[PDB]
From a paper:
The RNA-dependent RNA polymerase (RdRp), or non-structural 5B (NS5B) protein, catalyzes HCV RNA replication, i.e. the synthesis of single-stranded positive-strand RNA genomes. As such, it is an obvious target for antiviral intervention. The 3D structure of HCV RdRp revealed a ‘right hand’ shape, including ‘fingers’, ‘palm’ and ‘thumb’ subdomains (6–8). NNIs bind to one of the RdRp allosteric sites and this binding alters the 3D conformation of the enzyme, thereby impairing polymerase activity at the initiation step.
The X-ray crystal structure of quercetagetin bound to the HCV RdRp was solved by means of soaking experiments in apo crystals of NS5BΔ21. The structure displayed the typical right-hand shape of an RNA polymerase, with the palm, thumb and fingers subdomains organized around a central cleft defining the active site. Quercetagetin was found to bind to the fingers and C-terminal domains of HCV RdRp, at the entrance of the RNA template tunnel. The B ring of quercetagetin was clearly apparent in the electron density maps, whereas the orientation of the A and C rings was proposed based on partial density only, because this part of the molecule adopted several conformations. The structure showed that quercetagetin binds closely to residues D559, G557, G283, R168, F162, I160, A97 and S96, with its B ring within a 2.9–4.0 Å distance of these amino acids, making a π-stacking interaction with the side chain of F162 and one hydrogen bond with G283. That was the case of the strictly conserved G283 residue which interacts with the 2′-hydroxyl of the template RNA ±1 ribose and makes a hydrogen bond with the B ring of quercetagetin, and of the highly conserved F162 residue which stacks both the sugar of the RNA template pairing nucleotide and the B ring of quercetagetin at its top. Superimposition of our crystallographic structure with the recently published crystallographic structure of HCV NS5B in complex with primer-template RNA suggested that quercetagetin interferes with the ability of the enzyme to interact with RNA. Altogether, these results indicate that quercetagetin inhibits RNA binding to the HCV RdRp through a direct interaction with the enzyme. No change was observed for S96A and G557A, whereas susceptibility of the D559 variant was reduced 7-fold in the enzyme assay. Due to the conservation of the residues at the quercetagetin binding site across HCV genotypes, this new NNI binding site has the potential for pangenotypic activity.
Numbering used by the authors: 1 to 149, 153 to 541, 546 to 562
Write the structure that this text describes.
Amino acid sequence: SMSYTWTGALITPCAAEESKLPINPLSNSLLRHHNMVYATTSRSASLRQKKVTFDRLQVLDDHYRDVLKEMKAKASTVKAKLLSIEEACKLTPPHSAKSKFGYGAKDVRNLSSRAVNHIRSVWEDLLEDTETPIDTTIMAKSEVFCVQPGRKPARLIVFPDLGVRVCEKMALYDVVSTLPQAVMGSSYGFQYSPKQRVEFLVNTWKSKKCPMGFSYDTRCFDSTVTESDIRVEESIYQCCDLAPEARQAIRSLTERLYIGGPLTNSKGQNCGYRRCRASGVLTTSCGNTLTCYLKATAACRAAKLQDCTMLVNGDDLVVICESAGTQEDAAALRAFTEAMTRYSAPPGDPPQPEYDLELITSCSSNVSVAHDASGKRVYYLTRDPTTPLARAAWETARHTPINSWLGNIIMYAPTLWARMILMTHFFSILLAQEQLEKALDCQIYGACYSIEPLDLPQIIERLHGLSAFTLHSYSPGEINRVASCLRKLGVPPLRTWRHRARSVRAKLLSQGGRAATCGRYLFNWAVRTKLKLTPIPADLSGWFVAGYSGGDIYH
């Protein structure tokens, strides 16, 4: 079937839409080629629509069915509870989009009588009505990038009203937080902290006689997902032990929301109909992860690849296996791609087999190595820092709701760029406005978190260990990528950052505790006299459990 159908009516914005990085003394200190940085807008919506709208070919076989049953067997071990209204309400972000029926996120979070009663209605409606399609809104995402030597069109997000999103959580939060791990086991990506992810990739790599590995980029995954795929995904959820009201909710949400529905623009006009994954519902991450894992797992058998270990994060996929010789590896990977095409998951760019772990890009990241205080090799996780930096400039010049910089500091703390540029730049600013204490919103695996910068030393210690404060002797491939990037974007070269860092470090020391602890630990790479570095005195229990991208989750 057609992934989408369009009435012709436009995909509209609901506010002013900003697209150019402004000239600001704060952002210009970080990066100077301001005309290279842009945000996507709805002005580019039609270009995306063209890309996402197509006919899907899908043909299932024995291998598909075989893996599906294996997955269903493990799903049967799961007991899942209903959240109460209170729990589901406490999971709603404070800046989540308001309802059409006269209540917002603040009301939901307070359990105001109005929100609560509409939530009860929507739920009872899900128990009573098993067919009527449920309305969605469609909007062009605002995202920041650097120009390519050639712009990206905005992404399209699609989501139901707030009353439904609370009901999704009641019915499905426990499932989408526990079912993926029981089914995929060590292949479920979102269980791993960055240090744990690198551990798993290195251990898996070093466990093979002759490793070969590849990433596989599916072309616009959400549009490849068929109605069949979403019913199959429901067949997995239904293997859980569920309360009756849960089971019916899941059934109605599947037929009325997840498989498709009408699309409405911001002006209340009808844009079209959807027959694929919606980016903006609770089950997208779980569902995409399961679906990716299922097709890829079956395609591996079809391709005859040997001793496969896969690692899956929604629609991001990486596979490590036993080489069969370079040319036999190439023909097997091509068989794999073709199997996936049949399962309705064709490639964006053809995958290439790799024989050096550092050359594989999964979740926009790659493994690299450095050395700690005592000279031991420490494997860490990094990426091309262009987008982080472009966004960091943008978030310095403009107030955004989510601060990608802070999320990038946490995730990439041990990296060369995050340490010398991000920490330096942002801590210098927070000092100068006396806002070190103030908590800021960031995203980790799609969930929203309110973190305060003064907690970054211990957060980084837990997530990465003391070494993220003492790494040195980075590889030249990595130093070269960073240095080039900076020249391209007009970011000052690293020696400038070193000097700015020393000035910032000295200022944090002459402050107090905590602040000085930032100075001591975060900026020990800058100072002349190297320092002690003992563990730091000071709940991270729910941080790397599951993915929630598009799922409207706050913790």
